[PDB]
Amino acid sequence: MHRTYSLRNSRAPTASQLQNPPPPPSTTKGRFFGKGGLAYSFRRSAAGAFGPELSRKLSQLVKIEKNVLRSMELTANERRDAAKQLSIWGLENDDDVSDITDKLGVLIYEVSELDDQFIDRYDQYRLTLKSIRDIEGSVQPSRDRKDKITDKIAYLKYKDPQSPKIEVLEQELVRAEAESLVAEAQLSNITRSKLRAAFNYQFDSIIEHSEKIALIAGYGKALLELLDDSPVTPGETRPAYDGYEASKQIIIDAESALNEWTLDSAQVKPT
Amino acid sequence: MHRTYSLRNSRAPTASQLQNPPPPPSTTKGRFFGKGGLAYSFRRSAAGAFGPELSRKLSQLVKIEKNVLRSMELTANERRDAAKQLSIWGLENDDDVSDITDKLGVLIYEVSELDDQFIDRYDQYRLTLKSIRDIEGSVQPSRDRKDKITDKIAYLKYKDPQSPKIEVLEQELVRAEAESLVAEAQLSNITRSKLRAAFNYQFDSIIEHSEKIALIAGYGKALLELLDDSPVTPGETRPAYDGYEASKQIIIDAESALNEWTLDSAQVKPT
Amino acid sequence: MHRTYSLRNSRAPTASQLQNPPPPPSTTKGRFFGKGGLAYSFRRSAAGAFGPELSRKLSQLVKIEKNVLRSMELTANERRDAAKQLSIWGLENDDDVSDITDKLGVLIYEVSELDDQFIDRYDQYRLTLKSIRDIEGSVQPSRDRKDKITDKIAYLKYKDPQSPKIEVLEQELVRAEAESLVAEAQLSNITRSKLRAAFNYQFDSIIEHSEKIALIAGYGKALLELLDDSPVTPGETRPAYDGYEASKQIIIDAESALNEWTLDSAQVKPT
Ligand SMILES: O=P(O)(O)O[C@@H]1[C@H](O)[C@H](O)[C@@H](OP(=O)(O)O)[C@H](OP(=O)(O)O)[C@H]1O
Numbered sequence: 088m089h090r091t092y093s094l095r096n097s098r099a100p101t102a103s104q105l106q107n108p109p110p111p112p113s114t115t116k117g118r119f120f121g122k123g124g125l126a127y128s129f130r131r132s133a134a135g136a137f138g139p140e141l142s143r144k145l146s147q148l149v150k151i152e153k154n155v156l157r158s159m160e161l162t163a164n165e166r167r168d169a170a171k172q173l174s175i176w177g178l179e180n181d182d183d184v185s186d187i188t189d190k191l192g193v194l195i196y197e198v199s200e201l202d203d204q205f206i207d208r209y210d211q212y213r214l215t216l217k218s219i220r221d222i223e224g225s226v227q228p229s230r231d232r233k234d235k236i237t238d239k240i241a242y243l244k245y246k247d248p249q250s251p252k253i254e255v256l257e258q259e260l261v262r263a264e265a266e267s268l269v270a271e272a273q274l275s276n277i278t279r280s281k282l283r284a285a286f287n288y289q290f291d292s293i294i295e296h297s298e299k300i301a302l303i304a305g306y307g308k309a310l311l312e313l314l315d316d317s318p319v320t321p322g323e324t325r326p327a328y329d330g331y332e333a334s335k336q337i338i339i340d341a342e343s344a345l346n347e348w349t350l351d352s353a354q355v356k357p358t
Numbered sequence: 359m360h361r362t363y364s365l366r367n368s369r370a371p372t373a374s375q376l377q378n379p380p381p382p383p384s385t386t387k388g389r390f391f392g393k394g395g396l397a398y399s400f401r402r403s404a405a406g407a408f409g410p411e412l413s414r415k416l417s418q419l420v421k422i423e424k425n426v427l428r429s430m431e432l433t434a435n436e437r438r439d440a441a442k443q444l445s446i447w448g449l450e451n452d453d454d455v456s457d458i459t460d461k462l463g464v465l466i467y468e469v470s471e472l473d474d475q476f477i478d479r480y481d482q483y484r485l486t487l488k489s490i491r492d493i494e495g496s497v498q499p500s501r502d503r504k505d506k507i508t509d510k511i512a513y514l515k516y517k518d519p520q521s522p523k524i525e526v527l528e529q530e531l532v533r534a535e536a537e538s539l540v541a542e543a544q545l546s547n548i549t550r551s552k553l554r555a556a557f558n559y560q561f562d563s564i565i566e567h568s569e570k571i572a573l574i575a576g577y578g579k580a581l582l583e584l585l586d587d588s589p590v591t592p593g594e595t596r597p598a599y600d601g602y603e604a605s606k607q608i609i610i611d612a613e614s615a616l617n618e619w620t621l622d623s624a625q626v627k628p629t
Numbered sequence: 630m631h632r633t634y635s636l637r638n639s640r641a642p643t644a645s646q647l648q649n650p651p652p653p654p655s656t657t658k659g660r661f662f663g664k665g666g667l668a669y670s671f672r673r674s675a676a677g678a679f680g681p682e683l684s685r686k687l688s689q690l691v692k693i694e695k696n697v698l699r700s701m702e703l704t705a706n707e708r709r710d711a712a713k714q715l716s717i718w719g720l721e722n723d724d725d726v727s728d729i730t731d732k733l734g735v736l737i738y739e740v741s742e743l744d745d746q747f748i749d750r751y752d753q754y755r756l757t758l759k760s761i762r763d764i765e766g767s768v769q770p771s772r773d774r775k776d777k778i779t780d781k782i783a784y785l786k787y788k789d790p791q792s793p794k795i796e797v798l799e800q801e802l803v804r805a806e807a808e809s810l811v812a813e814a815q816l817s818n819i820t821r822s823k824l825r826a827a828f829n830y831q832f833d834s835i836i837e838h839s840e841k842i843a844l845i846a847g848y849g850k851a852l853l854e855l856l857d858d859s860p861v862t863p864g865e866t867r868p869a870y871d872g873y874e875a876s877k878q879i880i881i882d883a884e885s886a887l888n889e890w891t892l893d894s895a896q897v898k899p900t
């Protein structure tokens with residue numbers, strides 16, 4: 088929390104910063120947002136001023152979650168196609184390079200596969216929140232009607248106390264109060280349960296995806312460790328590379344580890 | 359690798375699938391790509407048909423990597439603003455909800471902070487690859503000139519063997535061959551080193567980011583475990599919630615764990 | 630499996646590739662398919678959109694199998710006529726060539742004979758699959774009627790619960806369910822048996838045909854080993870060739886080996 092504990096907008100030194108200086112900021116960060124034109128802004132603004140006042144914020148949150156989920160699909164597609172392009176480019180080189188590049192592309196290819204399942208779970212969580220939005224939006228009109236009846240009673244009492252509509256209006260008010268007494272309870276009963284369930288599901292999905300990505304990256308580093316390099320003098324010929332079998336075993340082990348992993352067998356143990 | 363080992367495009371059953379059935383595919387996946395208009399396609403196509411033939415593919419890969427890095431910035435911004443909106447919405451509710459929601463927003467807020475550093479490291483890796491692209495593009499013209507000289511010699515020998523330009527052309531050819539003999543060696547010397555260094559850096563960054571995200575999610579689940587829920591009957595009043603101190607300790611522990619973590623202290627140990 | 634384990638569409642090196650470099654791709658592979666006009670496409674498309682939905686795919690598979698079987702007949706006829714043409718051409722040459730060519734044509738002539746029996750067995754397998762297609766297509770309407778009755782009951786219950794048609798419709802539904810309970814079992818009983826029998830028959834036919842072809846080719850090489858060649862200087866006369874008897878013994882042995890071979894005496898023993 089650099090922003091919270093200091094007025095500075097920079098990054099405070101840490102263990103990672105002390106071990107390795109932070110890299111310079113990315114140069115391809117333009118001033119213009121370019122957030123997919125005005126479609127995002129329209130989807131963001133139109134949803135917050137149409138329906139009932141009680142459920143106005145959750146609709147905006149649902150729309151923003153939809154935009155968040157939409158972006159990751161494009162990211163995953165671009166990464167997969169980048170892996171394909173790297174594999175295509177690696178062909179017209181030396182034997183060892185034409186194999187290590189292909190294996191790295193194959194390994195990189197699974198990030199999009201993981202992201203697809205992550206997106207599906209994200210959509211499930213978004214639907215779970217939409218349910219709460221819907222129920223609260225349906226709940227609001229009862230309290231609206233009760234307030235209207237109370238205001239009508241208050242005005243008609245001031246206008247003239249001799250009107251015969253006092254008794255019927257009072258009975259309607261007590262009926263509306265009796266209805267709202269259970270309406271509020273049934274509204275408050277399910278929010279703390281559905282929110283908890285949705286957030287638990289989201290956190291479990293995040294943990295699983297992160298652990299799978301970390302395992303894939305570790306095995307990719309293990310495979311890349313095999314790529315031998317040494318300076319070559321002009322006129323010399325490098326020895327014939329014979330490492331085809333080891334890479335196959337490495338990727339087979341990667342597949343076995345990815346398939347065998349379960350949620351209960353999580354490697355990361357938070358303190 | 360479902361695609362590789364089976365002609366089916368579906369997902370083969372696994373341990374996670376057996377434990378929990380896969381969720382249905384996301385409904386908000388339209389047929390139209392909508393990949394930021396035609397700007398992406400133009401950046402993708404114009405770069406592959408302008409420069410030298412040798413370095414045509416790496417320029418396309420660099421552009422695609424730039425698009426990949428650009429997408430994650432928008433994703434992180436949208437996620438951060440979603441967290442802000444959730445924190446804003448959680449205010450007008452019960453005391454426990456008005457605090458758990460704020461703490462969850464605060465915890466979610468750091469994903470964008472991690473993504474910024476990930477993007478910076480991605481840009482560094484992209485520059486490292488661009489260096490190889492540049493050097494190979496500069497290398498190609500020497501072999502181009504050597505091929506041109508060889509073709510000229512071959513044609514002029516056929517035209518008439520009595521020309522006095524045979525000796526000078528042969529000397530130029532041997533000079534170009536002597537130059538290319540060291541040009542090829544100096545081209546091949548640095549590729550296997552720079553590629554290895556860039557990919558090692560990228561994998562280290564991926565591992566660090568994934569482990570930090572997993573730790574944050576685990577501590578978020580630990581904090582959310584405190585949110586007590588129980589059904590309430592109409593007319594009843596829930597007991598006053600007193601859990602302010604525990605959440606502060608939880609987030610302080612999260613900050614301490616995030617700051618203390620180092621690369622050498624990685625929790626995940628690939629087999 | 631080059632396609633599965635690598636994004637490349639080329640061929641990975643193997644023992645045969647290392648021993649002998651792969652030949653260049655055939656030059657007479659035009660871009661246009663020329664798959665017998667549009668008759669194949671019409672037979673392929675019309676069959677998949679006419680009958681019941683359940684048995685739509687197996688009809689397409691049967692049609693494609695028919696096309697596959699049809700192609701091999703033309704291939705065998707062309708190969709036989711090629712052998713005849715080679716035998717005709719070999720007449721107007723030296724004595725040894727006018728005999729070796731005839732013997733090779735005679736040996737080549739049996740490939741079409743083997744292909745005819747292979748085609749017959751292929752047709753038998755196709756009929757076996759057509760039986761399954763027919764039975765499943767006949768099975769589907771029972772479940773169709775049950776679904777229709779269920780939908781009618783569901784709609785009529787909503788329309789008005791006081792209708793006297795509830796009891797009769799429920800009895801019809803339970804009758805249809807009792808029928809479908811045995812219909813599904815009788816459908817699933819025979820598929821796993823007929824498919825297994827057909828595929829076993831097809832594999833046995835393939836093994837027999839391949840082994841016979843290999844034996845014929847081996848004996849053809851043995852016969853061709855007799856054709857002596859030596860460079861001849863101008864003005865010299867080659868010695869009179871006397872090898873008529875050996876070729877007759879070779880082809881007699883080929884006939885005896887082809888006739889004696891049985892399925893139980895298969896030379897190839899898979900590990
Ligand atoms: O200043 P501009 O007009 O915006 O253009 C940028 C820069 O000037 C170079 O043309 C280019 O680097 P290279 O010459 O090395 O390709 C870079 O591409 P990049 O961002 O992908 O590195 C562009 O973004």
Ligand SMILES: O=P(O)(O)O[C@@H]1[C@H](O)[C@H](O)[C@@H](OP(=O)(O)O)[C@H](OP(=O)(O)O)[C@H]1O
Binds near residue numbers: 149150153217386
């Ligand atoms: O069919 P359309 O015209 O594309 O509109 C979709 C759907 O019909 C609803 O209007 C809406 O669900 P809700 O009524 O529950 O808001 C949904 O929003 P969503 O994708 O964000 O769920 C839209 O995508």
Ligand SMILES: O=P(O)(O)O[C@@H]1[C@H](O)[C@H](O)[C@@H](OP(=O)(O)O)[C@H](OP(=O)(O)O)[C@H]1O
Binds near residue numbers: 657
């Ligand atoms: O270019 P085209 O018009 O398609 O004709 C091809 C080629 O140019 C030659 O005419 C011929 O080789 P030959 O001169 O040696 O006969 C070849 O026959 P082939 O494919 O049977 O070898 C033809 O396919």
